[model samples]
Target: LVNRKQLEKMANVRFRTQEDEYVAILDALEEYHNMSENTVVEKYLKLKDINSLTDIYIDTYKKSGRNKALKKFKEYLVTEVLELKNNNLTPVEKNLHFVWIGGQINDTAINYINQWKDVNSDYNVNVFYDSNAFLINTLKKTVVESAINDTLESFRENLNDPRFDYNKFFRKRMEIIYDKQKNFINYYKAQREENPELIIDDIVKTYLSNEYSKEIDELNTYIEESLNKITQNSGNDVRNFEEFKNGESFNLYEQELVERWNLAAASDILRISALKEIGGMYLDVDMLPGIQPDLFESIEKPVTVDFWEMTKLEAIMKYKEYIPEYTSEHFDMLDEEVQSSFESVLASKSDKSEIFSSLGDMEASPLEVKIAFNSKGIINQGLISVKDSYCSNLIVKQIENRYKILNNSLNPAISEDNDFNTTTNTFIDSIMAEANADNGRFMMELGKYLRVGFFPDVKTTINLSGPEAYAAAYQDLLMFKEGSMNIHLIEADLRNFEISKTNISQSTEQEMASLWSFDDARAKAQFEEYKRNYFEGSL
Candidate 1:
């Protein structure tokens, strides 16, 4: 049990810790707050006080030097309070409320005492202190009043913008913060309540540790499940290279292991590193190279089975009574050889393994089989016939009509003018006539230009020889008229006179640069000229 294979399996086992989970949750909250800050700034900027910022600045300080002095006083208050809390205060005294209150009182007293000196230089100390206190209180009240007015004005202006829903926006931001913080706080409180010895920081650390551990457990479970499936399918007890080679049944086991490896690699679930390790394995003679071009092409290209064909096959299998009618009516439309081949293909599918195995082992060489099967012209033809027969069946048509009816039943019908029947009839008539006369020549030509480039029928030829020959002559004529109008706008003035020399020269330079630079200007010019000559004045 303590062999190389067991040791290799154990090495792959991963673990997670609690701190990782806490950080992940906190990061999510921080991301939400970052987005919300923009909305908060936008709402704050709309307040009347914020809008009248110029007036407030004009009244507060006459010049730049006075403004700097006011800023310095504010800075002094902040610096002194922070310094006092840092050096002289206990941890309890440094709490937000205590420090804020002490700083406000001290800074106010300092400002007012200076003002009192101007009033009476020889005033009694006690009287001066009393006057200073009164003046300091007045100054505090004026500052608070100004701040309140400014904030209220900004709020009012933001309210006038109908799209600005302050309550909704603020609630969303608060909800985002509260959801994350509340979870963290509750977890902390619960731990402390359960164990009185638990400190707040210790609780936080424990919670994070638990989350990381849980993530590790989940990752390990995922890896175990993946490995178990691979092992079970391959019928291999060998987990490492040495055991894989030396085991008694190693050669037989390796064949299945190669199949499993190929399956896993093709699934795209394995990371690039895992694929490299798998690729390094020594493959048996029967195992094909994993990176075959045909296999890669098959994987890249989607397998598009017609749903109608599948439905028809299912119906034919389940309902024997319809088989005779289907064979006589639908199957008889094809040639004798085609009919025999189609019948043989359907009959051969009775054993699913026999039909699929004809292409080769899907697990061992899925890409190869996919390519070879899809490339068979006879198979493609049979598939098309199967799809056509299924779609054209009366039951399938009825089912499609029922779906349309059910969908339309949910909607309220308008007047006859809005009725879908009129539009449908008009579309059917126009398309039917065109298709019958030209045998879908317009669509075929259009598809060629778009580079869909499907092989045309025996009777039809690709019309690429003439550059001006369009898929739809009538549509091209209308486009010509539209192009001439644009040319007229660029060359002539509003009054239909030729442009002035300055205007003409500028227009010509712009036209030449735009038409002859990086873009295919010659193609654009040719298209415009073709349109102008063919359509004349009518658009």
Candidate 2:
């Protein structure tokens, strides 16, 4: 026996589908059997006004009722059709946790810290700085490199003396190098008293001391002190970072990466890893995260995530243009290895999703693999937040995608450790060349992006990592096609999150832009001509 409520609901069932007309038929028949009356079906039986199908179905009434009922039933059935279902998976509820990862405690970290506070001020700012967040700068080897570069950046900014690089002066008619560096090192040496900054001084005393010196015990002291300042400055510490450090397992050939300047890549993967392991949002140390004063109450939903989209041709042209003379000579590939081995790996991803939508689609080289990335999903990995590790798992898949692509031309053994070096490049020169040449290297490992955030953190350091991989990982995780356990645009845009990193001088931007442009009268003519012929060749 049908329940009275069920019969009533069927009687009242509104026109929902073309098949819904049949709903009246079903309801009427069922109610008839159960000896019940459905108001909607009864009213429907009236054929708008008159009662006909029940009693007076003679001639015209019968034909009209049959025709209209049949028509209505068909229409209702169409509307009544059930929707299949969306197989794509996504979070059922918004995870409103917050997190931040910091690498080195320099001005970049300091500046980012300031920005994070400035924005998060009018809000919960429960966001904590996980000081132990896997240190990409942990490779003891890169310490020498860092020391060398910091000294250089310091000098680059302050040009009181043009003879700075020479850092030299004629003492007793003797040409000396790094004299100014010598002076500053001496100053810091005294400042530290028994605890001097030898690492700072070591690089400076290149001529004085090839001895690579890093005061680890002293450095930790500095790290803790700066981290404490970060803690106080940012409403700090939700999770003790030290614990999770070991949680991130070393990838294959992990330690060998230290020499490659790929710390940023390590940082990228680790940030997402930590966020996955812990519940919170992850923002770049450079982004000044904040809940807008107006948006204070609307902080329930958030997103994590620019960089740019370029093609191998754009890359080619840029290379010819990057330092036209150098890059043009080194990077000539007029139809050589257009089919990139790495792209093949990307294409091989069984769960392949371009990681972007029609609007901000993924970008890739036209010939790297069978597909192009120019229209694929690529995004910044800085401002993402989530409830738990579910999101990070997808991110790890994307990183795995990167690792697969990298191993195509590299040793599958290379992990993120003393691991920064490549198979070819020698010493530091090889490292620089390898980092720069493997257009995919810096990006795959988050090396060059170190520049954008710390891009100013760049200069003599040619290839480390950049925003490309960080951006791409996001698209991979959230860059769902119309359906793929994900959706279009990931329903979150960069602005949707709320936050912000990195800066460069016009002079610096220009110089670095040149580092990848072909504007010089020398390279420009060749660049334009190449585009016309190669791009428009078959067109």
Candidate 3:
């Protein structure tokens, strides 16, 4: 019912009712046709009713003949509003959180956390202790369940083996099942003595019924005992416990339990949970600040460093021979033009011509982009910053759900290969070998290569807690940001940084120790050595 004159009059008016203000903004988006430079547009968009105004604007365009104008304005709104919220130079919150657990902590960790406080002194720094109620509870429930299920799955695998050693495997499991019940332990020993070849589903069933509760209790007890052990030995100083519990390090006692042993994943979950509840930056204990503080001040959206890998196009072309097998119906779900090009490529496979040029213009599948990102690394979960919104909750939900899936799987790699690092490593290694055979330019640092529409056959943490998770959770925002390396998908560049342990000695054993618990001065020394070498020429 409103006329253009009234809308124009309302647009020029200042400080009106919320409803009128929204329509005024809509009038501006409508009239300007080029809303990017209009001060009124930016002012209205930054209002608290920005979302409501956006809805009104979208609705107005849908009903009017300004479709082209709306498209341009929509892009601007998305870029100026949504993307600005994410990667803005202004942080959502200026705070930092670190999770340092396990029963032991090295001087390296103490120094690292302390350094974080010293450098980012203006920012609020928090340390989550071994006794963190939420983390301990999460491990008690989810991780414990994964362990018990994994043990049962191991029993089933042994049963299916052609050369199954039922007697040895069954007895060992029964011993763990009866660890507390001495009578049952003796009964198992006696039964094994009577019939060395005895095998029955009865024992496994007993584990499910009788031992499941006991095993859970035992595991729970292990957690309680281990956690209490750290507190009990804290030299009777409440201040020391309080300081450690509340974020402080003492030279006398610089330390740390969950037995599910996937504490790294738990730590991932913990950091995400913290960010979801309280927006901030979560840095791993081993990470030292390299970039200046101004760079951090610019972080407004969820951000993380890039995981470098081969380009998706390279991976797809290198594995051109496997297109038919690799192509799934998901490939058809892509654009019609893309499907046609790939179809042409497949049909011409027998000609042995330039397969690359035949499909050079085709876009890479989302899976192809993901596979490249997952090659030899993950989305760098070690450091992340996020606002407490849908994105944060989304990552948390994803990782939790993924943990559940891994927990229930027939072969749960919760502790070992849960992140699919080994699987990705192997897949990329195979691709690198094949590529190097044909071209001399391939290198290990180049990352893995895979077929256009296929990833490795093994389970993926890509969607679980890796790059895919973050990419999916924050896809809209990332689309606007420049890619750090390749542009098939969004890639974020974390400020120049280094991990003391990973880049220095490069020891998996040491990495694991650092992730869980470490007391060796070697770790502290390693950080010093790396920092010295790292800044040798730069300074």
Candidate 4:
């Protein structure tokens, strides 16, 4: 029932904007709510009536000179006053007038009061209000007050005497405590059952799926756009080529060539294939000419290829024209003389037909060219077979190594004597190494494309689950009591990602406001102040 808006209102009312004062109040509220239901209201009422009852007891005991009473009264005075002050309860004390009566209460009552001051003082109350305390206090004062009164009436009837015995009084108090505790426990359990952590997990999962899916789609679109741009310049026919040769032509041939060159530059078939291969999967290769013919064969037979061999073959055949261009661009950074010498060597080569007479005229035989490309593609396909065999062999070795480590640590079973520290470190290192290697390979490929004068697009896709896990890790690091402050890494990363996003959005508004002449410095400042007051202050 407590939505974000309602919670915001409650926070504003409780904290009064006094620098984390709200956090303390929320903590107190949580502690109260987590208590057993049967004991909760009575516990609250007991605290509420402490000042009045203590005053009467102190006055009565002062005349009697009972040391136990006086000692108890003094303890209450010292502890309760300090507890309230520590909790930033000056305003609360003034509103409730607890100081007036609390002054006379004994130490025993004060001890109980101080016990529930703040559970975790270091925690951010804004993020985590003691919902337990909030629930109990609200229920006691609002929902259960009438019930409490009726129960008190029943107790009086059972007692029958105007002045009940001390034992009877104690019994009545114990009964109230029992009832409240039982009721609260039942309520808490029911609530937990109705809405579990799995709900949160599901929500987080859905959010991540949508986010990552969008990112992956964007990456795919980027690749497609790059491909289109590259292929745009490739000549469809001799007319297109002739247009480029003619000075009167609008460089259409050059344009087509450049577009195709860019396509070769942006192509990530090898990279994509590597991912699939390593992850024990494959993707549609119909878009890749060199791979398509062999793909069906590979699927039918259990053959695989190494990424490097496949990539090299694709670069040589499917994108052969672009290779010279890629090489030229790559070596262009060399001295002018060196570049000219390289260009001369390339220029000396005759047309595809004349230079390689035995292979026949590749330019005239488009079908032959396609067939040759497919035949050469098999060489890359063979590499995949080697990769598959190597990977399979390694898998067994890795399994054996893992088993050995586990056996060494836990012996026959996972016993308490197991060296969990060493085992965990080894496992983590192995996994991290593999991940780092994969990431490094991708980065290297990206670097190679960049070096070849291609604009490389790099993107990351993360599911909501990953970010949620990161957030949890961050929270653990920052809020962990036992560990060193090294948790700042996660905190910094998360804050940079989450808090910075909000901060950037806020900054953008300011920047936009400043853009107009009507939005001068003074006007912008005034607008910002107004926005803050209107949004944050009102809430």
Candidate 5:
């Protein structure tokens, strides 16, 4: 029972294939109620006039009373046509969300948010802070779950291994302790001086005797206990997201890890979750858009920007050049056994000229390096847009899961210091080198190279939840292919749109230019004013 309404709706369908057009008409025919043949021809011709697809042959045969040709046409439509259905996915939205999670919002943050508001006046610019209890709790809950899962994974892998490397586990735990409590290093070295055989394992056993020790047996036992506790309390546990905020958890290690999370790490988690839950663009507080506001206005799909203009092959060569030098500098830091292992691995892949010159260069090197160096590469999370669709859900989960494993896992001897003085050469020198460099560790090193001039937070955020995770997810989902999932990469057209996180010195006094500075003097003044106002209100 075909109706005028069905024909009109079919007219609006964005038909990509002949099958789509045929199936649409067939579906209309199947439901079409009784109607006069003349009347049907009249409505279809009218529908065809509006760009609908009732064929001229069908119209002619119907009017001529040529029943045989019309019946064959209906049979062809039924047997030969099929349509690919993309039922629920929605288009990207114009909304934007920013995260400033600390209790107080600084004047600099206010200015940045306000600037975005002014430029994207039509967009719903939202900034999440302490005011959003649900967001804060959700962030905490994610952190808790990720930490527990990471720990459980680590413990299970070690417990199941045929030959568990105790020395590796001992050193890894000590490094985390050193990262957590800087003064503990001096204490460790002092203890090591007194007893020549004193290993990291012994120090951890004495100092962190209770639960946080990196001892394999202790970790294994703790995981089993925690799993049982979680299962036992599963029925009674109805804790809200807010309840997790106060350091209570089925796994105490998870609670402690959450408590130790830095502001930078927390922001990385919250920003992605916010963007996923609320369909919009996710911009870092530092990211500003301006050089071409009109460009953003016209964007209809999810967008991630390219960091550099070079192709994937060029990026690979650049990465290869850096790796040899980096490996040479850090190779000596590894223990004797570890050194032998890494050299063996390096020897196997040293024939870069033969392996990387071909079209198959992407498969030759680590994906981390390729991702960082390709055209439409370095998918900077500082400024990304997404709708609350499958795309958003996919990326958000990737980042959260990757951040947990990478952040919690032990790296092969690379030491990132907190004093903010670690340069490429020096940071590599103090390297805590491991023999087997996995994707996670290699990616961390790549991040170190990418964020050389910036502060530690920049590197932390980029590796943990920013570019690396996004690029991996993008590649995994094959988002580059044109299909139902339409995503765009806004390349670095220097005049129109540069990557927003520019050094303060690089910034010019251009009104519409989109630029960001880490610690501008103006921002400092704004923070001072903000503090004064905040304190005055308290008084």
Candidate 6:
């Protein structure tokens, strides 16, 4: 497929520099084998695109990558948070679209959205205000008293059964432990109890000991430890589960669901519906004003959701599967020598093959990576830019299908079961704890491709939306899409949406009120008081 004239022009052209360019050519991987400087230049020309050849000339001179790889990388970062004027671009529209649901919008969200209007006088903002629509959502405010009691009873009954599963036994035990802790803590508080007293704690321990046959020390080891530890390995997506949860800052239904339900499921589905009704980018209320105003000026794709632009290891390790991929029969069919050599290579951590031979274009293809990289997975749905026909229509239908399949898969509810309502169009008496838990699990079955081996006793479940569901819909579309999409993720670092997760945590109720109410001058005066009254600089 190499063009002779293109190669001649490319070879006659300037240069090749750095490993980064080589990575893009190799399909987001390492280099062509060690070649002479002229030899590598030929490899660049061998690429089908003329632009790839032009990029070789871009070199390491300016910060920009002149090559095709770096140009393609532009689908990732916005790099223009300051709303810089793009000399080459022109305005596409006069109307702006931003959705805000849930009870109300805070000052942070309101101010940031207004920031958009202030910067662009030509465009008028349309704020969707529908509290009724918001309430008719899968946003489970809290685990209800009935559902909670029934689910716990089922677990308690299961423990009394004669059978026991070693692998699942520990997992079930922890679930029971967490459930009991929440129950005891809430019951104790419901009595209007407030003290540093050990009496109530001792009573719960003694009751738990009789109920589950555990020592007080064992109870102490797990109660606080497990409660605090749930958020640790969460892909750095969640802020702080317990801190926000403990302070009653993060809502209870939400505080606990990150432990239970897929939060992204609710957020993504809601955004898709809003986008379908009115075509526009869906920005999470938490997102700050990091995007350039002219982001959509030259947007080429119908759907402009950006990728994370990951490193090789980021893609590989991001999604992991605990269940087996290859069967024992398949592995055993290979020679003992083959097994030994393969095992040796796999076991080593820091040392492995320097570069893989055949991993190619499919490697950079996020569609391929997502589909095969564990069970249904996707990246953050924080911001999605799109056209209504392709992006909005496609997503609404996909998510509706996902929800139906999810509901059909789960067992009938233990409590009152009702069909979907025509008036509200909501799922009523939906699948409970164990059912949803099963929905999350994935593994290959003996013959069928449709399943990840299903085991009833062991738990895994999928909810309405999350990164997985978000990724799966995109996986199908992006796999066959023709042209490149122009989307940008304005990366946020260090600072949070509040710009004060730290100081707020340290500040008291009175301090927070003043911080909120004060003007800039008053705020600066208070800032001085913190250091002036607290820290000694001389030390």
* Best prediction by TM-score: 3
Error of 2 at 330 (Å): 38
Runs of candidate 3 with Cα error greater than 4 angstroms are 1-69, 82-95, 101-125, 130-262, 291-462, 476-489, 492-539
TM agreement with the true structure for every prediction: 0.15, 0.35, 0.37, 0.17, 0.34, 0.30
* Model 2, CA-based lDDT: 0.32
Please state every model's RMSD to the true fold in angstroms: 41.7, 22.8, 22.3, 38.9, 23.7, 25.3
Ordered list by lDDT, greatest first: 3, 5, 2, 6, 4, 1
| TM-score between candidate 4 and the true structure | 0.17
TM-score, cand. 5: 0.34
Give candidate 2 regions above 4 Å deviation: 1-104, 107-224, 227-261, 289-378, 389-391, 404-409, 412-422, 425-539
After superposing candidate 1, which stretches have Cα over 4 Å from the reference? 1-227, 235-305, 309-350, 357-539
Candidate 5, after superposition: displacement of residue 426 in Å?
Answer: 21
Encode model 3's per-residue lDDT on 313-339: one tens digit a residue: 222323443222322323334455544
Best candidate, lDDT-wise? Answer: 3
What do the candidate models score in CA lDDT, each in turn? 0.25, 0.32, 0.37, 0.26, 0.37, 0.31
Residue lDDT tens for model 5, 1-539 = 22445534443334322344445554545444332343322333332232223454345434333334334444333221111001112344566666554233445445445545554545666665432111222233333333333333354444324354433333333333333344344455578799977643354445444333235465335434433433332111112224323421212222122333244445555555555554555655544343322212222222124311111112222333422211232233435563454343334454433222211101110111111122435544343333343334455556555534433432323244443233334444433342133353544454343232222223545555556555444433332111111123333311121222321111112211323433444434433443344345421
Query: What is the Å distance of residue 514 in model 1 from its true position?
Result: 46
Q: Which is the better candidate, 2 or 6, if ranked by TM-score?
A: 2
Name the candidate, 2 or 4, with the larger lDDT value.
2
Candidate 5 Cα deviation (angstroms), residue 461: 3.6
Candidate 6's C-alpha runs over 4 A off are 1-96, 133-266, 291-386, 411-463, 478-539
Model 4 C-alpha lDDT per residue in residues 1-539, reported as the tens digit of each score: 12223333433433233333333333433443454453322333333343334344445445433334333433443343223222321110000000100011223322211211121122111110111111122222222233333334555344334343424332333344334433443444454487675222232223223532324444334334433432332202222223223432222211112211221111121211221122211111111112222222221211134322232222222222522212222233445553344344345444332111121111111000000012111101101111122222222222223223323422222222224234334443443443343234322222221112111122111111112223332222222211111223433233321211100111111122322332234433433443344344331
| Candidate 4 regions with alpha-carbon error over 4 angstroms | 1-205, 209-330, 350-396, 399-539
Model 5 superposed RMSD (Cα): 23.7
